[PDB]
DNA sequence: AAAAGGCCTGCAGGCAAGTGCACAAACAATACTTAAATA
């Protein structure tokens, strides 16, 4: 009922304590680097926007940022005796010239005031701004996105604080965070204005994804998260460097969500976590051991010893006719090391440092070392030939660890992550089936009006008719079953009485078009082409 | 190019449309609705467990989540996971996103003491200069260093609503979904929710993805939005309002365009409208006849093209049920 | 309701009743802030509410964006003490009902008593003027020929107190 | 049987019917600022 006001609010387990204990040092690793990577970039602009004295001094040093996030906070020197005002603009707080230069002189007022403890917004501020607060002063301006501000505006904006350079007593210092391109930049902006920026800049990068000193610095750190616990096969680590490809800027932040929302899939129904430390073979059941045999590692060495063991009789004692023998002959190969971890380090350090190379992949490399065309990996470079040996690492096939390890092969967390959100929609509104298990006659002898409208839909041509369509659903429309349903009602009365009217089907059937026409346009599919017309229609999904 | 055009439809009143609708959505799948319910409820702890890192969960599927949005919200997640903490059951912040009044300030306005007034940010409160987005920056900068529970429980309603899929809005959902003392979970209904956001939007909400069809009739999202059925009827009440003489005039007109759905070659010409208005003693002269005329084109209740045709658009059928019902 | 353009300062307007002194900024604004304001103090008489002439509050601003929301928050009687604020509301030009929400107006609302009061010819208004005049003047003139005037008027006409204020001036 | 005067028909010479629609300005009321009344 009053649902229709606006968002007026209301009022009103070990397999997941290791998950805890686990989950929080791959957590920890992550931010561990994650504040690396910060300080890095903190102390790197702080340090660049200093010390640069360049003897003309009648021009504002710039600092782009080259790949910037635009998200990258800064910080000032203290520096007493001068004010370190930092301002901050925004595509959003850029409608024109005039209010830019508002905007800004009120934001460095109010922060000379919270510094200082009747002012006209506009350059006066600038000089008056010594005897207003005694110390000199140097501002810094950081564009927050520039790729989608006017850049006539910007210009015209760069060309007025120029004037401010006739007062001495002020230094400015400008911060571009361009998205990209630094050519965009220079292909918009006045030449003649360029050639004033251009006195001492610094293509500084910003850039998360860069020879992945940080990405493969931080897949090495879960290979050690994970490293001796459990396992994960090519399909996963191939469906990683996939989904990763395809998202250039921001890789390690996807990165670490993928990794964590399979782990909590696995912690959630493996039921296996309490099995890679020996401190929990106790915490074994029957029916547990009843799942440890549909293994396909299980399967597997069955038919191995059926084949080499020629004689059946010790495979068979071996075999369910024995449990704690069994559960012994399970646990013999739990402890597979899997240097495919250790030497994954070994060759990962080495190449690091030994031969030194940068312009490389880790989680590529952990692919061709589960491979083993790690030849044809490092081949790359053509540095390992002498090393190829003592880096050489065959895969080793290790043995039951299909219950310790990580695989997409039911896609549940890629369904999950990366549906597909139209094809997923066409699907279950066309068949609707799959998920649709006194009334229910007409449920079973005919569609939800979504999907068997829907399928109508497709056939449609590029602009159709409204009433063409209300036609050719009529023909969709059982009359016999509408009067069996509006009359099976016989409780109500106004119900019952529109129950006799004679021509209640094309009624009706005007009623459930134009609700549903109605619920289709919200979602999407249907576009009501020409509001205040509304005589045809476009049908913008297509299947495909 | 005679198209069929939605005039000649059957009409049905607010009142039978409105009752046979509620019929329908209230008995046409019950059964199934009840058992894919009943159902789903069981991910519930699923949910639990996937919000405990604070993965925001975007809810797709078609049918309207509204109902059990609520109903998923309101219900289990909320009180059950405040008790699970070790007191006011965490109040459910709802967004109408449906609703177009929804304004990105105001809300904020409200999130604002909802969150923690530690201090007194109000004296951060300045000029137009938006403190929402530099106080919800501060506001990040507090929580990187508090602990790590749910404070507050946000659910919206149609994340492609027609004020919270402004940019303006969505990025400033952004920049507060990256608060991790705050579950998000929302839903939407335009099929092409990925364009909405970047990687860098992405990364903000961290979004998790999943399915939820149930087949709903949109029972409030139909309220907001409007199509022709919410003219011929329009003018049907006004007509009922006039003055005797307008009534005969109307009568006579209707007559002349109906003798001949009502097509325009079945009007008649404003000479011999005129010369009948006179031959009956109804109108004095042209003026007084094209005045008595514009009351009802000042409401577009008649339509007039050239011959000087005024044709009725009305139906036939209409038309000659204003005769045997209102006019006669 | 005519030179408003917004629910505040309407039901301060009410407040003018009480003879008193209040903060009534809210209390006068939000639809629930309204029904916190309208509990009766003296006796437990009822207070009923009516909106003279909200053919300007109707004709105000931007329909779907203060005119409608305006109508909406007043117009919703949800309140629990069935005594509430029943409006007894006027409206000129029949399209208000028409720009209702569809949903809102069939099921709830002051609404389905629609009233109407058609121009009366002769029958109701005239037997007014005579009713008020009672004391009839000696030589009015020809009653027939009054009801002449009448209805050669009212052809196009809605004021016969004003036909016969030409009358006064004829005579 | 083919090459050279002559004459017939396929391609389009063309353009008004005509709708889309991408330009513009106030637009209806946003969002916020600044002086006043009361403790």
Redesign the interface.
Known sequence: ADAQRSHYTVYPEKRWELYHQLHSHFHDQVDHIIDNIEADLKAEISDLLYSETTQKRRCFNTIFLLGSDSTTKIELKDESSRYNVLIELTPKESPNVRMMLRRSMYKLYSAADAEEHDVSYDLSLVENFKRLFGKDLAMVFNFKDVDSINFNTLDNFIILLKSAFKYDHVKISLIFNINTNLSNIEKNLRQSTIRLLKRNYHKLDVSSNKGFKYGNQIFQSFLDTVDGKLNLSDRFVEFILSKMANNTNHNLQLLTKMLDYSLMSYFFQNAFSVFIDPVNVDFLNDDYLKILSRCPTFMFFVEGLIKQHAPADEILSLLTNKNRGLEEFFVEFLVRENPINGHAKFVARFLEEELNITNFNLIELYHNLLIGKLDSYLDRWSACKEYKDRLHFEPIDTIFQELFTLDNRSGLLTQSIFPSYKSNIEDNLLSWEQVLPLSGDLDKIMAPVLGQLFKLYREANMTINIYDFYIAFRETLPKEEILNFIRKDPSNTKLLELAETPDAFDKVALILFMQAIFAFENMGLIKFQSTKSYDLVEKCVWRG | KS????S?????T????????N??NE??????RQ??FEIQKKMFP?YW??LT?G?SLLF????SK?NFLEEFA?DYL??KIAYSQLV?????????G??P??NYRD?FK?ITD?LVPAELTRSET??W??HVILQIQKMIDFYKNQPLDIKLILVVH?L?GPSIRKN?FQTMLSFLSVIRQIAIVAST??????LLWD??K??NY?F????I?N?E??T???????????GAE?AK??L??????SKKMYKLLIETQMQNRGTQRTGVELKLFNHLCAADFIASNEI?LR??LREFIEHKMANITKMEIIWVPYTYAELEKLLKTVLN | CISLGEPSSIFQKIFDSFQDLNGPTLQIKNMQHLQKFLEPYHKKTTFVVVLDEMDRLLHANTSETQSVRTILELFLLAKLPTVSFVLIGMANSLDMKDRFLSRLNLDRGLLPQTIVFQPYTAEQMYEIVIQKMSSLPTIIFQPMAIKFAAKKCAGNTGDLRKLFDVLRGSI
């Open positions: 198209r069929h055009t939605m000649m439809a059957p009409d049905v607010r009142e039978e449309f409105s009752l046979v609708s019929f329908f008995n046409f799948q019950k059964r199934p058992k894919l699923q467990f996937e890192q993965f797709y599927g078609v049918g509204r309101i909320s009180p006011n059951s965490i109040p459910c912040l709802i967004l109408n449906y609703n009044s929804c809300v409200e909802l300045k000029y200069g938006n149609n492609d303006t209904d335009h099929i092409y929710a990925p990687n860098m992405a990364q961290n998790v993805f999943h399915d069809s087949f009739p949109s409030v999202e139909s309220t907001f939005q409007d199509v022709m059925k919410m329009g009440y006004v009922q309002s006039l003055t005797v003489n007084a005045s008595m």
